[PDB]
């Protein structure tokens, strides 16, 4: 058995995106498929379902009219149409299959899910990040600022891959200003300090960001 | 329609000791008569980032391959989760979801992590480089490393003076070998403010601290 | 009181109990399921498949007005009014060995209500009498004063 969205990314406020289920592993064209979406937060929150031949769609208040679910059973993949989108419409779309049996009515019983799509709703436009360092002062603590981005994820490695043990990157924090802060942090020998070399490798795809920065001692 | 709560937001338990999530509906989710009673009412495994699985059904039958360890109770308007004896493996978040009405409404879930002994955290203080300073900005970083409870409180002080609103906290998930935790708190000032003033301290109050914890600077330096 | 009858084609039938509509079809396709579904034991049941009071009666009369014996035969299936996918009440009329009885029951009562009735049902193959509450999302665009209009 296998479920597999793909699509969604980053989109502005206003604008469309197209999300796709893979299926596989069951009869595709004879069971009921829903949309359910996770913001961050906690919150599961149901989206959609739709029946084996697409004749009863059922939608969410919060999404009814906006959103269009439709499925394509000889290629037993299930689609999701979001239009219009909107902040609050930030989440991880998961697909689900009802536990409902053939021509049965949905038992709002999800048996299998997939591993879910993030879907990112923001007027901020793409960031490269300000990279600074945290000087340090029997151990040590060294690290890297990685502020004022946009979307995420960011990838931070220590001695380009060589520096493991001991780092901690913190889950980025999203700002006043609609852009994410991060910071990485490293604990190493007070000894080596005057020694060994220690740069962050920064790294922000959507931007094309590659940096690198040197962490010299106070 | 129908609201979930679920409680306690995150609990932490030994290795072998039994966890015990409660769930509670805003309506009754139950159908009686016949002779059969059910109880509209599933629960399921979220670990971080795979894909979330049915674990519980009809609020109390096991999905078919959840271990036994897993069990499910409860009637009407109140339920439980019970993991028997706690494996690494059952860390994870758990939601409980009602489908008697549509539509179909989960919980805010549990989060189930370890509990270990209690862990100072080792306190860092970082000033803001002078590479960012030039850039009209000033970022004064404070370090927890390594700790247990997730419970501590950073204060930062600025010439004597409580500062709120201004910093931003950030916390690692538990580790996976010591299950301890790391925490981050940044202090974001006006380049300009930050030139007015001297001393910068950051207060780190904790259980396994014996008196509060101050890492401090001068902007002299 | 008596709730005024009709018919379209062969399988669209009509039914309406004072300001309410309801829809009879005939399907082949098992709907409503056993175990997850509403069993209709009494007519006290029935309230709990329309939003209103005021329908139950002309369901209960048409139910019984087919043949179906409360004490005896066997519950109906009826999708709950918790459920937005509409109310709908389903009869197992099925030419398989178990409810082959009550199969030709509500048949030569349909016969009996409607002259323009024909058993459309296959031998030992699964037969239902589906209803549905006209507004209802379950009844569709067939409750619409379009097939409306055809009728008394
Ligand atoms: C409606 O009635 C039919 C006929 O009794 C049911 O179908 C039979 O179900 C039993 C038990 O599952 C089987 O042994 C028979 O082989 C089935 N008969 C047919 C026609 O194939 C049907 O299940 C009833 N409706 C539901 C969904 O409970």
């Known amino acids: 058995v296998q479920l597999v969205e793909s699509g969604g990314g980053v989109v502005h406020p206003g604008r469309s995106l197209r999300l796709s289920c893979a299926a596989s592993?069951?009869?595709?064209?004879?069971?009921?498929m829903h949309w359910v979406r996770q913001a961050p937060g906690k919150g599961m929150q149901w989206v959609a379902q739709?029946?084996?031949?697409?004749?009863?769609?059922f939608y969410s208040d919060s999404v009814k009219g906006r959103f269009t679910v439709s499925r394509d059973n000889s290629k037993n993949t299930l689609f999701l149409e979001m239009s219009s989108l909107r902040i609050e419409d930030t989440a991880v779309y998961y697909c689900?299959?009802?536990?409902?049996?053939?021509?049965?009515?949905?038992?709002?019983?999800?048996?299998?899910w997939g591993q879910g799509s993030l879907v990112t709703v923001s007027g901020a436009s793409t960031k490269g990040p300000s990279v600074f360092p945290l000087a340090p002062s029997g151990t040590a603590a060294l690290g890297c600022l990685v502020k004022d981005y946009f979307p995420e994820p960011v990838t931070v490695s220590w001695n380009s891959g060589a520096l493991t043990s001991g780092v901690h990157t913190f889950p980025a924090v999203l700002q006043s200003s609609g852009l994410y802060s991060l910071s990485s942090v490293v604990t190493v020998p007070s000894s080596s300090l005057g020694t060994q070399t220690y740069i962050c490798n920064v790294n922000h795809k959507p931007s094309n960001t590659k940096v690198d920065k040197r962490v010299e001692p106070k | 329609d129908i609201v979930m709560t679920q409680s306690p937001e995150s609990l932490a338990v030994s290795l072998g000791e039994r966890a015990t999530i409660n769930c509670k509906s805003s309506q009754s989710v139950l159908y009686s008569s016949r002779s059969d009673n059910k109880d509209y009412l599933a629960w399921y495994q979220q670990k971080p980032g795979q894909s979330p699985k049915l674990l519980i059904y009809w609020a109390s039958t096991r999905e078919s391959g959840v271990p036994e360890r897993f069990t499910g109770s409860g009637s009407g308007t109140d339920f439980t989760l019970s993991i028997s004896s706690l494996q690494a493996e059952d860390v994870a978040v758990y939601y409980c979801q009602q489908y008697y009405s549509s539509p179909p409404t989960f919980g805010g879930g549990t989060k189930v992590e370890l509990k270990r002994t209690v862990a100072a955290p080792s306190v860092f203080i970082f000033p803001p480089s002078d590479e960012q300073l030039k850039s009209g900005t000033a970022s004064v970083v404070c370090l927890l490393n390594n700790f247990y409870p997730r419970e501590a409180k950073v204060q930062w002080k600025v010439d004597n003076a409580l500062q709120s609103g201004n910093s931003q906290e950030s916390v690692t998930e538990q580790d996976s070998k010591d299950s301890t935790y790391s925490l981050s708190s940044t202090l974001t000032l006006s380049k300009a403010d930050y030139e007015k003033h001297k001393v910068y301290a950051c207060e780190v109050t904790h259980q396994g601290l014996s008196s509060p914890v101050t890492k401090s600077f001068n902007r002299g330096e | 009181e008596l709730p005024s009858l009709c018919m379209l084609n062969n399988s669209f039938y009509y039914m309406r109990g004072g300001v309410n509509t309801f829809l009879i079809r005939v399907s082949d396709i098992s709907v409503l399921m056993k175990e997850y579904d509403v069993s209709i034991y009494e007519p006290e049941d029935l309230g709990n498949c329309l939003n209103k009071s005021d329908s139950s009666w002309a369901i209960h009369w048409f139910s019984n007005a087919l043949g179906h014996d409360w004490l005896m035969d066997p519950p109906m299936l009826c999708r709950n009014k918790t459920k937005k996918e509409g109310s709908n009440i389903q009869f197992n009329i099925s030419k398989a060995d178990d409810a082959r009885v009550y199969g030709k029951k509500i048949r030569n009562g349909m016969r009996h209500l409607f002259r323009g009735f024909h058993d459309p049902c296959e031998e030992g193959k699964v037969c239902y009498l589906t209803i549905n509450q006209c507004g209802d999302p379950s009844s569709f665009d067939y409750c619409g004063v379009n097939h409306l209009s055809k009728c008394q």
């Open positions: 689900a299959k009802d536990l409902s049996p053939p021509y049965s009515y949905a038992w709002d019983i999800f048996q299998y």
């Open positions: 592993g069951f009869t595709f064209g004879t069971s009921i």
């Open positions: 739709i029946s084996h031949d697409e004749s009863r769609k």
